[PDB]
PDB file of N, CA and C and ligand atoms in Angstrom:
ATOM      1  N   UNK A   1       8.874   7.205   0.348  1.00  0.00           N
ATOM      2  CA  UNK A   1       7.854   6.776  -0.599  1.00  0.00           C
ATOM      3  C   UNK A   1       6.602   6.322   0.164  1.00  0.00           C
ATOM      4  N   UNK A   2       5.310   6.648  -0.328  1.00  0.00           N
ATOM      5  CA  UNK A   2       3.975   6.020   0.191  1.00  0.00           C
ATOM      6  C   UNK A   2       3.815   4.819   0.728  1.00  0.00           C
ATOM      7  N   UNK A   3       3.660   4.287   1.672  1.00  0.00           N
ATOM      8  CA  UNK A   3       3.277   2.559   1.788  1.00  0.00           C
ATOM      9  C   UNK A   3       1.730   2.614   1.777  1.00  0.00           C
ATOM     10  N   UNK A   4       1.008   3.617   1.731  1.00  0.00           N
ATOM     11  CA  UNK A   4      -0.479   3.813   2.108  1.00  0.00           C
ATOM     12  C   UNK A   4      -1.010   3.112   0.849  1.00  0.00           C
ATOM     13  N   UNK A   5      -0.749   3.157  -0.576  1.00  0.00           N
ATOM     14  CA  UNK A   5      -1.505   2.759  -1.635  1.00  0.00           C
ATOM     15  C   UNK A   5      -1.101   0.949  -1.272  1.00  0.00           C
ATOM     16  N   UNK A   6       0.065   0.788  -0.812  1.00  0.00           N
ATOM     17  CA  UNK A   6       0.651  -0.610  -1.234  1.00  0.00           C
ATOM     18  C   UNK A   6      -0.131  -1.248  -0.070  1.00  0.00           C
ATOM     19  N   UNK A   7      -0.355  -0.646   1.229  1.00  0.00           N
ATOM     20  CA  UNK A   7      -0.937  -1.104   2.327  1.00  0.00           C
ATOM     21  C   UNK A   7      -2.807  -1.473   2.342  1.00  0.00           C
ATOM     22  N   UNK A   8      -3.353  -0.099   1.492  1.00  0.00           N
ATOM     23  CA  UNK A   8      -4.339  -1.027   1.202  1.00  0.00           C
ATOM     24  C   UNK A   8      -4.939  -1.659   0.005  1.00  0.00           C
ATOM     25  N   UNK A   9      -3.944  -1.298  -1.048  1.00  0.00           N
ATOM     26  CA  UNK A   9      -4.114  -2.262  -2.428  1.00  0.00           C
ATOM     27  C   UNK A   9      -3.954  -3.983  -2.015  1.00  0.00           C
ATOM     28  N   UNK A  10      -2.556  -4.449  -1.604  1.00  0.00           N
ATOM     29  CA  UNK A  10      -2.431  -6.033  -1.286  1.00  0.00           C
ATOM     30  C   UNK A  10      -3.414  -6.761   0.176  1.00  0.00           C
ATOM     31  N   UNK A  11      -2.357  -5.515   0.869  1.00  0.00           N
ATOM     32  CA  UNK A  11      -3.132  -6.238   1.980  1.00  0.00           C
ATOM     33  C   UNK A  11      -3.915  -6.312   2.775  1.00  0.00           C
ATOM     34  N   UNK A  12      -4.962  -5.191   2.991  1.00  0.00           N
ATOM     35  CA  UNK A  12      -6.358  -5.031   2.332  1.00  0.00           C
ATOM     36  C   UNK A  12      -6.949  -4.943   1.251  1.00  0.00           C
TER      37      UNK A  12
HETATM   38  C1  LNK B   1      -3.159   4.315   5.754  1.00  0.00           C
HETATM   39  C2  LNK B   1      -3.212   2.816   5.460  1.00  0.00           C
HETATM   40  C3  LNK B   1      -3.944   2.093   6.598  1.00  0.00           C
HETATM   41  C4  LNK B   1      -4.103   0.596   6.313  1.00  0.00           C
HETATM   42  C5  LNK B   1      -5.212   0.335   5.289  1.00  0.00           C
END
């Protein structure tokens, strides 16, 4: 699964 949306939605 993606971490790219989750990586810069929160924590950027
Ligand atoms: C691809 C995600 C890099 C951190 C914003």
């Amino acid at each position: 699964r993606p971490l790219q949306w989750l990586a810069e939605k929160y924590f950027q």
